[PDB]
């Protein structure tokens, strides 16, 4: 009870030390580049609208990065090795779908998990409408759509965008969806423009699907 | 580690100096704002209500003396990114919209050491448009005017990034193909008054994909 009281104290001190005694991280720079790793867990293709060529997806998007400013010694803070905090309390990356047709809708709480090595894991559940021609969805071959994700303002020398794997996580995909998944991939792509040295890096989500019988 | 920590400290210090230490333009201190559109999709054309929906990136550029700095004073920082809320942004509005514009992108701008700002909101817009003829060879034509809500051309002068809309990212499997798309600066005067009023007219000719 008094050990539980002190555990609370220790955690409030840690959070205070990291958040209230250091104005926020101003984001990455070319001198101080950040790796951000992306993973999709696809839950459902909710809707495919052939009158407008818009398809609606529900997924969990895993975002992982590490900051030196968020490291601590557990020994200095009652052996605490991780904590949870409002995503508002910290910097998060500006990873955006480039061909959405409506603002993304947030389906989960905005809370991040920080570990003592300074790694942050943030997993927003989202409903996304994006540009997609569902022609052929109603057939053996099905339909194929794609949407690229990337930073809005940072090049590949500022945010190095990665996936740990090119296979989308389909383990939680809704088994009674109107649409079955034939395949889903998440592939890092790098581009160079002739003006400029820096890489521009996208993650391409490609989904092949058809009407479930 | 020390040199990345000083680089962070140098950026944190630039932003602090620039910000927590601009009332908008006036006729004595006028501003030029340059617009450019990257049309991605005509998503919907509604002939029951004469509303057409577009998805586009709107590039906005302007330059403020109060945002200038010498890179030599701040670790050779030449540019930075910051939330659009941290700076003044222009009141550029579509004049014949039928619903509030929906923003699709992070509201983050880039500032360069010469005071130039680039801000690129991605948007979905419903506007007034009769799509009659969209199923013909000549297609439909619609137009929407963009301008300031409160400033004349003595206060905000508007210019376009060429008169050709950027179609390089137009969705290849859209329900509609683009015949043409132009973005043209127009000066208007009213009989009463000497001031110019500056519009940017976005004109799109399109038809059903064959």
């Amino acid at each position: 009870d008094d050990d539980k009281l002190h555990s609370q104290a220790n955690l409030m001190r840690l959070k205070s030390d990291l958040f209230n005694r250091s104005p926020m991280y101003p984001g990455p720079t070319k001198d101080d580049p950040l790796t951000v790793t992306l993973g999709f867990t696809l839950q459902d293709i909710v809707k495919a609208d052939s009158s407008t060529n818009e398809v609606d997806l529900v997924y969990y998007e895993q975002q992982r990065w590490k900051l030196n400013s968020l490291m601590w010694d557990p020994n200095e803070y009652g052996n605490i090795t991780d904590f949870r905090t409002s995503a508002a309390d910290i910097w998060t990356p500006d990873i955006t779908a480039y061909s959405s047709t409506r603002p993304v809708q947030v389906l989960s709480p905005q809370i991040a998990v920080v570990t003592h090595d300074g790694s942050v894991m943030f997993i927003p559940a989202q409903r996304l409408s994006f540009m997609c021609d569902p022609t052929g969805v109603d057939s053996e071959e099905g339909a194929t759509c794609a949407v690229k994700f990337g930073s809005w303002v940072y090049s590949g020398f500022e945010i190095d965008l990665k996936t740990d794997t090119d296979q989308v996580d389909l383990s939680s995909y809704y088994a009674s969806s109107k649409y079955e998944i034939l395949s889903a991939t998440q592939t890092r792509q790098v581009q160079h423009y002739s003006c400029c040295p820096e890489p521009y890096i996208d993650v391409n989500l490609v989904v092949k699907f058809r009407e479930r019988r | 580690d020390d040199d990345k920590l000083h680089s962070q400290a140098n950026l944190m210090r630039l932003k602090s100096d620039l910000f927590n230490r601009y009332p908008g333009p006036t006729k004595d201190d006028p501003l030029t704002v340059t617009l450019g559109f990257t049309l991605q999709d005509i998503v919907k054309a509604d002939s029951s209500t004469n509303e057409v929906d577009l998805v586009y990136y709107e590039q906005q550029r302007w330059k403020l003396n109060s945002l200038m700095w010498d890179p030599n004073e701040y670790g050779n920082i030449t540019d930075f990114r910051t939330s659009a809320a941290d700076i003044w942004t222009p009141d550029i509005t579509a004049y014949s919209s039928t619903r509030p514009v929906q923003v699709l992108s992070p509201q983050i701008a880039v500032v360069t050491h010469d005071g130039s700002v680039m801000f690129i909101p991605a948007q979905r817009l419903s506007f007034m448009c009769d799509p009659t003829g969209v199923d013909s060879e000549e297609g439909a034509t619609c137009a929407v005017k963009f301008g300031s809500w409160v400033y004349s051309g003595f206060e905000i002068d508007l210019k376009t990034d060429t008169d050709q809309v950027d179609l390089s990212s137009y969705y290849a499997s859209s329900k509609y193909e683009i015949l043409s798309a132009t973005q043209t600066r127009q000066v208007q005067h009213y009989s009463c008054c000497p001031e110019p009023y500056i519009d940017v007219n976005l004109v799109v000719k399109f038809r059903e994909r064959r």
Partner: peptide
Amino acid sequence: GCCSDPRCAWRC
């Protein structure tokens, strides 16, 4: 191209 890419267009 660079001028259409929101991460790069500020350079143009």
